[PDB]
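Q: Could you predict the 3D structure of Nuclear pore complex protein Nup153?
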Amino acid sequence: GSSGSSGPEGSWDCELCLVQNKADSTKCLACESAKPGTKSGFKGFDT
Ligand SMILES: [Zn+2]
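A: Sure. Here are the predicted structure tokens for Nuclear pore complex protein Nup153:
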């Protein structure tokens, strides 16, 4: 559900060096790369 769900939530696992990182942190620590994410402002069909 919403609270307590099966699966690691929060921390984001890196792909470049394949090393775990802190949620708050935006970039990696081992490779110092840019965390995979999207741009600000949701997208969709609107007028
Ligand atoms: Zn990394």
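Q: Anything worth pointing out?
A: The CA atoms of residues 19 and 30 lie 7 Å apart.
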